[PDB]
Amino acid sequence: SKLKPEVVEELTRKTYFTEKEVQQWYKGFIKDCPSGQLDAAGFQKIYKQFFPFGDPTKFATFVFNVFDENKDGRIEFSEFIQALSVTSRGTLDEKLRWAFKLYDLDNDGYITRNEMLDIVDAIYQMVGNTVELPEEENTPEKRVDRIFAMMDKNADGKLTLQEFQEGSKAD
């Protein structure tokens, strides 16, 4: 597991990691994925280990496809480390820009309510829901209805990156 110096330096520059951290992430990545390429089955295996009695199929697939920047069916180290940099160390605006790419499942530039429900449902499918009274059930649908309506300031049925990035931010 030896990364070429020019690659280490470029991936350093492109991320929030120090050169040492990039090499440490590579050593662990190659330890777990000796070919240097993580596939979708191995990506879902990670989530099933977290939540062995949820169903992570949907969430893992949605996130995998976003992480797989060149859509070759594999997460390579360059993809791995740039994805980890933004999702773990980004600013709030950068983390939400990443999340917008995830939620915008058909890549038409907007988040529609069905798309927000697909992600939220994927999440609850994997990790579960908070047990509640049958009259106050924590259904993704009613949660999405609330949040989606709050963020759709112009009520056109669709969310821009700007509408989304302002969702938890206070004024």
Partner: peptide, 28 residues
């Protein structure tokens, strides 16, 4: 006690954290 961040489910932050944690598990 609810998981701290799942209040952020639907806002983007929950997905981001879960994504990050999967990558961290993939490299440890």
């Amino acid at each position: 006690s609810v998981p701290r961040f799942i209040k952020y489910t639907g806002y983007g932050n929950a997905a981001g954290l879960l994504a990050a944690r999967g990558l961290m598990a993939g490299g440890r």
